[PDB]
Write a protein that binds this ligand. Structure first.
Ligand code: HEM
Ligand code: HEM
Ligand code: HEM
Ligand code: HEM
Ligand code: HEM
Ligand SMILES: C/C=C(C)/C=C/C=C/[C@H](OC)[C@@H](C)[C@@H](OC)[C@@H](C)CCc1oc2c(O)c(OC)cc(OC)c2c(=O)c1C
Ligand SMILES: C/C=C(C)/C=C/C=C/[C@H](OC)[C@@H](C)[C@@H](OC)[C@@H](C)CCc1oc2c(O)c(OC)cc(OC)c2c(=O)c1C
Ligand SMILES: CCCCCCCCO[C@@H]1[C@@H](O)[C@H](O)[C@@H](CO)O[C@H]1O
Ligand code: FES
Ligand code: FES
Ligand SMILES: [Sr+2]
Ligand SMILES: [Sr+2]
Lengths: 428, 179, 256, 428, 256, 179
C-alpha cells in the first residue's frame, strides 16, 4: 500500500509476454517492493528459512530415490545410502542437519517477531499463517525422524502417536487410526513416508501466502514505525528498493550461514543428533537414554513437568472429576504452550509496536528467551530434583508471560518515545 | 416460491451425501488392514525361567513382561495398602473389571510368583526398564519417569494406570497362553 | 542407567585434518577377524569395502580371498557357498552380541559438563574411545563392595554403564558405587593374542586402540570424503562471503 | 480484460480480512469472471481434467501409504492393497482408471482447441503451458505404470529408458543415469517412485498458471469472436458471470461424467488395461503380447512405423552419414509428432480464429481426428502388412497437417463470415 | 504367438448383478487342493480369506484345520510348523507351474473383432473361461498333422496358444495349423477324480467349471464388494445428475 | 569505473561456481551406486543342453541366450552373403571389433553349435522370442517387430544391430564363463 512505480515492458518479447501473461510483472512487484532502510540482521532469518525449505526438499526428493519405507529394509536402506549412493553420506547428513538449521532459524525468526511487535496488527494474518507453518514443520520433522527406523525413531513414534491416545473418549480410536494397528509397525512407517513427502509442499504453499501477506502490509522495522504512505517522495526517504539492496545482504548473510552450516555437516554431522538412532529399532526395549530432538526439548520439558503430584494438576484432576489427569494435562500443557503463542496478537494489549520502546516489556521478554533456553536445557536432564522444579517454574513463567504479563503491561507500562520516522532513525 | 428453492435444497442435499461417501473411505483406509486384524494367541514356554527373571516377549506388536517374582518381590507387593496406590483397579482382564490392585489380583497363581503383564507404560507407550528398578522395586519408564512397584502398579509419575494384565493362563506345566 | 568415564585416546582421525591410518585399520581388521568376529558381526559392512579408498584399502585379490572364509547362504540357490566381496560380513554369531557395524557411532563417551554437551563439542562424541575403554576396562580384581556377590556369567567393567550391579554396591538411594558395572562380554583381549605380521606390538592396549579405529572406519567409511568435502565448501563460502560482503558494503555505502 | 466489478467486503470479518490479505477478493475475481454465453459442451473438459488431477492426487497419497517401492515387495505390496486395505481394491482401480479418464479428457481438451483456434493468438502462452502439462502428465503416467512392477511394467520401463539410449553420443550415458545401473532394476523403481510422487505437484503448479493465463486473456468461444471490451453494458450482452451459470454447468457435467466413470470402475475396471501386468515382472521374458497403454498407442504407432526399410529413413540415414538411423529416426518422429503440435500457433497462418468458419480447414481437421483414432487403433495391431502401411500413411498425414496443410490453407482458403458479436450468435 | 477360441461358460458371477456361488467356490477349493495344488500355488492368497464374506465363506475352525495341511517355514523360528490361517497358500510346488493367484485376471479369452476389443466390451476379459477351456481342451488324440512329431513332455491343447508346434503343422509362412498348441501341463482332470460331499457330479466338465470360478474368486476376492460399491455410486450420481440437470436448466432458462 | 564492476563480476563468478558444485552431486547421486558396480562373471553349466535348445540366464540384470544350434540352424546361418545382412559387424567381444557378421564369427565353436549372446534386442531393449521364430529362423522381438536370423543377426525392423556377444568362453567341458 506504499507509493512505488510499477512494471513497464521494454523488449519486444516482454511486451508480447506482458499482454498475455504478466508473470514478469508479478516477479517485479515482488522483488522491487520498497523496504525500510533500518532493517537489521534479525531480518535475514526469513530467507535462511526459505533456503532450508528448498534444501530440505531437493535433498529429500533425492534421498527418497534410495530409501525403502518398510521395516525390514528401511534402516539398511539408509546405511545403503550412506555407504553406496554417490555422495549419499553427504546428502543424508545434509537433510538431517538441514532440519536443525531449519529450526534454529524459526526460533530466531519467531523471537525476533515477539520482540518487535511483528505480530501486532495489522500483521495478524502473517503471524497466524506463520504459526501454521510452525506446526506443519514439526509434524513433518517428526515423521522424517521416524523413517530411518532406529531406536529413537520407533519409540519416538510410539510416544507421539501416544499423545493422541491422551484425548478423552475418542483418543484410543484416533490413535489406532494413526498407527494403522495395535502397535507402531510397518503400516505406520509406510503412511508416515507418504506424509513426510506430502507436508513439505503444503508448507511451501503456506510460505507463499505468508509472503503474500507481509507483502500486503509492508514489512515491519526495528522502530515499529510505519513507512510514510503520502508521497513517493518521502516514502523513498524511509525506504530503498528491495532489489538489489536487500537481495544482496540476504545472499551475503546466506553465505555466512552456509559457511557455518557446512562446517558442521562437514566436520561434526553427528553432533546435533542421538547416538541411539544408529541402533536398529527394537520393539521390546526402550533405550535408557531416550531423549527427543533438541528442537523439541522445550515443549517436551513442559509436558513432563506435570506429574500426578503437581498441585495444579491435582486441583485440576479433582475439579474435572478425574477426566483431566496428569497425562492429558501434560498434553494440554504442551499444545497449549504453543497455542498461547499463537494468540499473542490478542494477549498483548500495549499499542506500542516495537518492543525497543517498552522498558518493562524488555525485562520479561528476555526472561522468556532465557526460559526457552532453560526449558530446552532441562528436557535433556532427568526427572529428579532439582530439575522437576526448574522445569515447573520454567513452564510456569512461560504461560505467565503470555496469559498475564503482556495483558497487564499493556495498561501499566510507561512507553518511551518512538522516532517520528524511519528516516530519522536511519540517519542516526 | 419454494418450487425452485426445494430443488436447490434437495440438490445440495444429495451433494453433501456423496461428498461424505467419498471422505469416509479415504479415512477408513487408514484403519487396521485385514492382515493386522489377525489377533492371534501365542504360547510361551516358561520352563527356563528361574525366579528373579523377566521374560520379554512380543505379542500384537508390543512387549509383554513375564516375571517369576522373588520372595523379596512378592513381599513388598503384599505390604502396600490399596489406598496408598495411585491406581486402585487391578486392570486385569482375567478377572472382574471391578477388582482391586491387590498384589493377589495382579498375579496368575495364588502363590503370586507369576506376574504377567503388558510391558507398556500407560503414560505414552514405552517399555519400562525392569529388573527391580525405580523407587519401588519394580520398573522405571525412562520416557517421562514413571515408577511401578513389584506388582506392576503405578506409584509415581504421569502414568495414570497400572500395567494391564492381558488374558493369560497356564495351559499346562510350563506354558502360558497369552490371548 | 547413566554416564561414565572414558580414556581419551588421541586417534589419528580426529580433528578437521584427521585421516585414518591405513595400517592401523588393517591391524584392526585382523583383530576383528581373529577375535571379535567370533561373537560379533558387521551386517551393514560390505566386505568389498575393505578395498575402497580411504580405509584399509586392501588389494582386490586379498579381499576376494578373505571373503572366502565366510560360509554365506546364496540368494537364489538357498544352499551355501564361499563368500564373495559382494557379501556383507555376517550377522553376529552370538545371539546377544551386538552388531558392531555402527558401534563406533552408537555410543558417546564424552558427556556434559552440567549436561551442556560442551564436552562433546571439543572432544567429539567419543564412540571409538568408549569402545577402547570397554576393551581396556576389564580389571583383574572386582571392586571391593561386590567382593562376594558377582552375578554368575557377567564381568565387572570400568567403562560399561548399563550393566547390572550387586545390591551390595548401591548407595542409600539405589545409585551405583562402582565406576562401571557388570557386562555379559567376557574379557576378549589378552596380551599378544594376535601376531601382527610386521611384528607391531600386540599389547592389549594396542589391539584395542587399533580394532577401535577399525571399527570407527567400519561405521564411518566415508569419513575422509566427508571432511575433504568440508574444506571445499568452507573455502567457496569463506571467499564468496568476503566478496559478497564488499559487494554489499559498496552497494549500501551509496545510501548511508 | 473485460469490464466488470470487483468484490467489496460486507461483513466485518471481511473488511478486517481484506485490509490484510485480500485472498477472498482474488477468489472472487477468479470465480466471477465474465464468460461468453455461447460456450458449448466442449468447454467442460477443462474441469473434468481438474477433477482428475485432484482425484489422482488424493487416491495417490492414500495408495502411497500402503505401497512398497522395492522389487521384492512392490507387486505383493499392491495385491496387499487389493486384498487387505479397507477399500483398497476400489482405490487402486480408481487411481488407474483415473489415468485413462485423465487422458480421454486431455485429448478432447486438445482437439477442442485445435478446432476452435484456442491456440491462435493471443492465447499462445496458454497453449504452450498446456503442452508442458501434457508432457508432464505422460511422464508421470509412465512411472506410475512402472510401480506395480508387473510384466508390462518392467519391459515398458526398459523400453522408455531405451528411447534415451537412442540419442547419439550422450545417449548411453543418459540412459545408464536414468536406470541407476546396467539394467532396469530396483534402483530404477525406487527413483521412479520419488518422481511419480513429485511430478503431479509440478503439474498442479503449471495448471495454476494455465488458468492464470487464460484468465488474463479471457476465454475463447465457438465463434472465435472476442467479447466487446468497450462498455460494461455491451460486455454483459456477450457474457454472463461465471458463477453460478457455468460453475453449475460444470458440476452438472462433472456428475454425468463421474456416473460413467464409476460405472467402469465398478463394473469393468480391468477393461482399459493389460492382463499381462497381473503377471509378476520377469527380467528374462518379454510377453508376446506386450502393448502399451492405449493413451500412448498413437505415439507408439508412429515410432514403429519407421523401420530400416522406409525410404525417408534411408534418405535420412544416407544424408546423415549413418548418424540418424531407423532407431533414432523413430524416436525423433515420435517426440517430433508432439513438438509440431506445440508449434501449431505458428504453423497455422490463417487469421480466422474459429475453425467453424473455414470450409477447407474442417476437412483436414476431421481427417486429423480420424487419423489420431486410426493411429491408436494400429498401435494395437502387428507389424505385418497392411498395418505397416496404414501406420505409415497415418504418421505421414499427421505431419502433413501441421507442417504443410495448415500453412498453405492460410493463404488459399476463402473463409466464411463470422458473426459480428457473441450476442448475435447466442440469440440465434 | 497369437489368440484363440474359448468356450463361453455362463458363470454365476458375470453381469453387473452377478455374484459368486458359495458352494461352487467350495467345490472348487476342493479341486484346487486335491488336484491343482499338487503343482500350482497361490502365494498372494491369504488362507484366512477362505473365511471372509463374499467368497467360499468357510467356518474359521474348518479354515484353521485346513491351514494345517501345509507346512511353512516360520518367519522368526526358521523351523517348520503347521499352517495358520494367517499364512498364504504356498508357492507353486512344480518349478515351472505358474502361480494361480491372479490367473483369471491375467488371461483374456475374448479378443477383437478386428482388434477393436469390442468383443471384450460385451463378454468381459474371459479369464475364467480361458482357464476352463484349457482344462477342457485336452483331446485324447493329437491332431493328425503332428501324428509322429509330438515334442516330449508336452501335450496338445485346443485352447492354449503360446505353446510350441511341430513344423509339420505350420503353413507356408510358419503360422500354425492347429487350433491350439503343446502345453507342458499333463491333463490333470479325469471324470470323478474328486468326491464331492453332497454327491454333486464330478464330471471333468463340472470340476473345471468350478475350480475356475474358485480361481476367479481367488484372484478377485473383493468382486462383489466392488460391484455393490458400483450400484451405489451410480445411484447417487444418476440422481444427483437429474437434479443438477434441472437445477441447470432452470438457472440458464433465465437468460435464453 | 570497472573497480566495482570487477568485484560484481568476480562475485557472480564464484556464485555460479558454487551453484554448479551443488547441482552436480544432486545429479551424480543417480548414477550407479557402489553396489551395482560389482560386475561379476558368472558360470553356466551347459551339460543338460541338447541341440535345438536355448538356455536363458540372467546376468548383469539382462537376459543372455545360450542356444545349442541344430544343423538346420547352422546351415542357414552360413547360407547368407554378408552383403545381405543389415549389420555387418560381428558385434563379438571375444574377437576383433572389426570382424564381420559371418555366421562363423558369431559362434564360439568352429562347428557353430554354441551361439551365446545377449537376449537384448538392440532396438529399445526387449528379450526377443526364441524357438526359431521370425522371418529368418531366429528370434522375433515383439516390442517393435524386429527379426533376427539363426546367428542372431538383425534382418528386419528398427533394430540397428545384431545381438551382441559378451565375453564368453568354455572354461571346460560343460561350462561357459560369461564375463
Ligand atoms: C520440512 C522439510 C523436511 C524436513 C524438516 C525433513 C526432516 C527429516 C528428518 C529430521 C529426517 C531424519 C534424519 C535422520 O535420518 O536422522 C528425514 C529423513 C528423511 N526425509 Fe525428510 N524432511 C523434509 C522433507 C523431505 C522431503 C520433501 C522428502 C521427500 C521428497 C524427504 C524424504 C526423507 C527421507 C527418505 C528420509 C529418510 C532418510 C534419512 O533419514 O536421511 N524429506 N527428513
Ligand atoms: C517456512 C518457514 C518460514 C519462512 C520461509 C518464512 C519467511 C519469512 C520471510 C522471508 C519474511 C520476511 C522477512 C522477515 O522479516 O523475516 C517473514 C516475515 C515474518 N515471518 Fe516468517 N517465515 C517462516 C516461518 C514463520 C513462522 C514459524 C513464524 C512465526 C509464526 C513467522 C512469522 C513471521 C512474521 C511475523 C514476519 C513479519 C512479517 C512483516 O514484517 O509483515 N514466519 N517470514
Ligand atoms: C492438467 C490438465 C489440464 C487442465 C486441468 C486444464 C484446464 C483448463 C481449463 C479449466 C480451461 C478453461 C475451461 C475449458 O476450456 O475447459 C482450459 C483451457 C484451455 N486449455 Fe487446458 N487444461 C489442461 C491441459 C491442457 C493441455 C494439455 C492443453 C493443450 C496444450 C491445454 C490447452 C488449453 C487451451 C488452449 C485452453 C483455452 C483457453 C482460452 O480459451 O483462452 N490445456 N484448460
Ligand atoms: C497425474 C496424477 C497421477 C497419475 C496420472 C498417476 C498415474 C498412475 C498410474 C497409471 C499408476 C499405475 C496404476 C495401475 O496399477 O494400473 C499409478 C500408480 C501409483 N501411483 Fe499414481 N498417478 C498420479 C499421481 C500420484 C500421486 C500424487 C501419488 C502419490 C505419490 C501416486 C502414487 C501412486 C502409487 C503409490 C502407485 C502404485 C500402486 C498402483 O496404483 O498400482 N500417484 N499412478
Ligand atoms: C485342475 C488343476 C489345475 C488347474 C486349474 C491348472 C491350471 C493351469 C493354468 C491356467 C495354466 C496356465 C495356462 C497358460 O499359461 O495360459 C497351467 C499351466 C501349467 N500347469 Fe496347471 N493346472 C492344474 C493342474 C496342474 C497339475 C496337477 C500340474 C502338475 C502335474 C500342472 C502343471 C502345469 C504346468 C507345468 C503348467 C505350465 C506349462 C506350460 O506353460 O505349458 N497343472 N495350469
Ligand atoms: C501422522 C502423525 C502426526 C501428524 C503427529 C503429529 C504430532 C505433531 C506434534 O507437532 C505438531 C508433535 C511432533 C510435537 O508436539 C507439539 C512435538 C513437540 C512432540 C514432542 C515430543 O517428542 C518426543 C520425541 O521426539 C521422542 O523421541 C526422541 C521421545 C519422546 O518421549 C520420550 C518425545 C516426547 O515425549 C515429546 C512430547
Ligand atoms: C524421469 C523421467 C522419465 C524416465 C521420463 C520418461 C518419459 C517418457 C515419455 O514421456 C515423454 C513417454 C511416456 C511417451 O513418449 C512421449 C510415450 C508416448 C512412450 C511411448 C511408448 O510406451 C511404451 C510402453 O508404455 C510399453 O509398456 C507396455 C511398452 C512399449 O514398447 C512396446 C512402449 C513404447 O514402445 C512406446 C514408444
Ligand atoms: C457406459 C458403461 C456401461 C457399462 C456396463 C458394464 C456391464 C459390465 O458387466 C461386466 C461383465 O461383462 C464381466 O464379465 C464381469 C466380470 O466379473 O463384470 C461385470 O461387471
Ligand atoms: S511413556 Fe512412560 S513415563 Fe511417559
Ligand atoms: S525393442 Fe525390440 S523391436 Fe523394439
Ligand atoms: Sr580424543
Ligand atoms: Sr460367459
Amino acid at each position: 500500500g506504499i507509493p512505488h512505480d510499477h512494471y513497464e515492458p521494454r523488449t519486444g518479447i516482454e511486451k508480447w509476454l506482458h499482454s498475455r501473461l504478466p508473470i514478469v510483472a508479478l516477479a517485479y512487484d515482488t522483488i522491487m517492493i520498497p523496504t525500510p532502510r533500518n532493517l537489521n540482521w534479525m531480518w535475514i532469518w526469513g530467507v535462511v528459512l526459505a533456503f532450508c525449505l528448498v534444501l530440505q526438499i531437493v535433498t529429500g526428493i533425492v534421498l527418497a530415490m534410495h530409501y525403502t519405507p518398510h521395516v525390514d529394509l528401511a534402516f539398511a536402506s539408509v546405511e545403503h545410502i550412506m555407504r553406496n549412493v554417490n555422495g549419499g553420506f553427504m546428502l543424508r547428513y545434509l537433510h538431517a542437519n538441514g532440519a536443525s538449521l531449519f529450526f534454529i532459524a524459526v526460533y530466531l525468526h519467531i523471537f525476533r517477531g515477539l520482540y518487535y511487535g511483528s505480530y501486532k496488527a495489522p500483521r495478524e494474518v502473517t503471524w497466524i499463517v506463520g504459526m501454521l507453518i510452525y506446526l506443519a514443520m514439526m509434524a513433518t520433522a517428526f515423521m522424517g525422524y521416524v523413517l530411518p527406523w532406529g531406536q529413537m525413531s520407533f519409540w519416538g513414534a510410539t510416544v507421539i502417536t501416544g499423545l493422541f491416545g491422551a484425548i478423552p473418549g475418542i483418543g484410543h480410536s484416533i490413535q489406532t487410526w494413526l498407527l494403522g494397528g495395535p502397535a507402531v509397525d510397518n503400516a505406520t512407517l509406510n503412511r508416515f513416508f507418504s506424509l513426510h513427502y506430502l507436508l513439505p509442499f503444503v508448507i511451501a504453499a503456506l510460505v507463499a501466502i505468508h509472503i503474500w501477506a507481509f507483502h500486503s502490509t509492508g514489512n515491519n522495522n526495528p522502530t515499529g514505525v510505519e513507512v510514510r504512505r503520502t508521497s513517493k517522495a518521502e516514502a523513498q526517504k524511509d525506504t530503498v528498493p528491495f532489489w538489489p539492496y536487500f537481495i544482496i545482504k540476504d545472499v551475503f548473510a546466506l553465505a555466512v550461514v552456509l559457511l557455518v552450516f557446512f562446517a558442521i555437516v562437514g566436520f561434526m554431522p553427528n553432533y546435533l543428533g542421538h547416538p541411539d538412532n544408529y541402533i536398529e529399532a527394537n520393539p521390546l526395549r526402550t533405550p535408557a537414554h531416550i531423549v527427543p530432538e533438541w528442537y523439541f526439548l522445550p515443549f517436551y520439558a513442559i509436558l513432563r513437568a506435570f506429574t500426578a503430584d503437581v498441585w495444579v494438576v491435582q486441583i485440576a484432576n479433582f475439579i474435572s472429576f478425574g477426566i483431566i489427569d496428569a497425562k492429558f494435562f501434560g498434553v494440554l500443557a504442551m499444545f497449549g504452550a504453543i497455542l498461547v503463542m499463537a494468540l499473542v496478537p490478542w494477549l498483548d494489549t500495549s499499542p506500542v509496536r516495537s518492543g525497543r520502546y517498552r522498558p518493562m516489556f524488555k525485562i520479561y521478554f528476555w526472561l522468556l528467551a532465557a526460559d526457552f533456553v532453560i526449558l530446552t536445557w532441562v528436557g535433556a536432564q532427568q526427572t529428579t530434583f532439582p530439575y522437576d522444579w526448574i522445569s515447573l517454574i520454567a513452564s510456569a513463567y512461560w504461560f505467565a508471560y503470555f496469559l498475564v504479563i503482556l495483558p497487564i503491561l499493556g495498561a501499566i507500562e510507561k512507553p518511551v518515545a518512538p522516532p517520528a520516522t524511519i528516516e530519522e532513525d536511519f540517519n542516526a | 416460491g419454494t418450487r425452485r428453492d426445494f430443488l436447490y435444497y434437495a440438490t445440495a442435499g444429495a451433494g453433501a451425501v456423496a461428498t461424505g461417501a467419498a471422505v469416509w473411505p479415504l479415512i477408513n483406509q487408514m484403519n487396521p488392514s485385514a492382515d493386522v486384524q489377525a489377533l492371534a494367541s501365542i504360547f510361551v514356554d516358561v520352563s527356563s525361567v528361574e525366579p528373579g527373571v523377566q521374560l520379554t516377549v512380543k505379542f500384537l506388536g508390543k512387549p509383554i513382561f513375564i516375571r517369576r517374582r522373588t520372595e523379596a518381590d512378592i513381599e513388598l507387593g503384599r505390604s502396600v495398602q490399596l489406598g496408598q496406590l495411585v491406581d486402585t483397579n487391578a486392570r486385569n482382564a482375567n478377572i472382574d473389571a471391578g477388582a482391586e490392585a491387590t498384589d493377589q489380583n495382579r498375579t496368575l497363581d495364588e502363590a503370586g510368583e507369576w506376574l504377567v503383564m503388558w510391558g507398556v507404560c500407560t503414560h505414552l507407550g514405552c517399555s519400562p526398564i525392569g529388573g527391580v528398578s525405580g523407587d519401588f522395586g519394580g520398573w522405571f519408564c525412562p520416557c517421562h519417569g514413571s515408577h511401578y512397584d513389584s506388582a506392576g502398579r503405578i506409584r509415581k509419575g504421569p502414568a495414570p494406570e497400572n500395567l494391564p494384565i492381558p488374558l493369560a493362563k497356564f495351559i499346562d506345566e510350563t506354558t502360558i497362553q497369552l490371548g | 542407567a547413566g554416564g561414565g568415564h572414558v580414556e581419551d585416546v588421541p586417534f589419528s582421525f580426529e580433528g578437521p585434518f584427521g585421516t585414518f591410518d591405513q595400517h592401523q585399520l588393517q591391524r584392526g581388521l585382523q583383530v576383528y577377524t581373529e577375535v571379535c568376529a567370533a561373537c560379533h558381526g558387521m551386517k551393514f559392512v560390505p566386505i568389498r569395502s575393505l578395498s575402497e579408498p580411504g580405509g584399509p584399502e586392501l588389494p582386490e585379490d586379498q579381499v576376494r580371498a578373505y571373503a572366502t572364509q565366510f560360509t554365506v547362504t546364496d540368494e537364489e540357490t538357498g544352499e551355501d557357498r564361499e563368500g564373495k566381496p559382494t557379501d556383507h560380513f555376517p550377522h553376529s554369531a552370538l545371539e546377544n552380541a551386538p552388531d558392531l557395524s555402527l558401534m563406533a557411532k552408537a555410543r558417546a563417551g564424552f558427556h556434559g559438563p552440567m549436561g551442556t554437551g560442551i564436552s562433546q563439542l571439543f572432544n567429539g562424541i567419543g564412540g571409538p574411545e568408549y569402545i577402547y575403554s570397554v576393551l581396556t576396562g576389564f580389571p583383574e580384581e572386582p571392586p571391593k563392595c561386590a567382593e562376594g556377590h558377582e552375578p554368575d556369567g557377567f564381568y565387572y567393567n570400568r567403562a560399561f554403564q548399563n550393566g547390572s550391579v550387586p545390591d551390595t554396591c548401591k548407595d542409600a538411594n539405589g545409585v551405583k558405587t562402582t565406576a562401571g558395572s557388570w557386562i555379559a562380554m567376557p574379557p576378549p583381549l589378552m596380551d599378544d593374542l594376535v601376531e601382527y605380521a610386521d611384528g607391531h606390538d600386540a599389547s592389549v592396549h594396542a589391539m584395542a586402540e587399533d580394532v577401535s579405529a577399525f571399527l570407527m572406519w567400519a561405521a564411518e567409511p566415508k569419513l575422509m570424503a566427508r571432511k575433504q568435502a568440508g574444506f571445499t565448501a568452507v573455502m567457496f563460502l569463506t571467499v564468496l562471503s568476503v566478496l559478497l560482503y564488499l559487494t554489499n558494503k559498496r552497494l549500501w555505502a551509496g545510501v548511508k
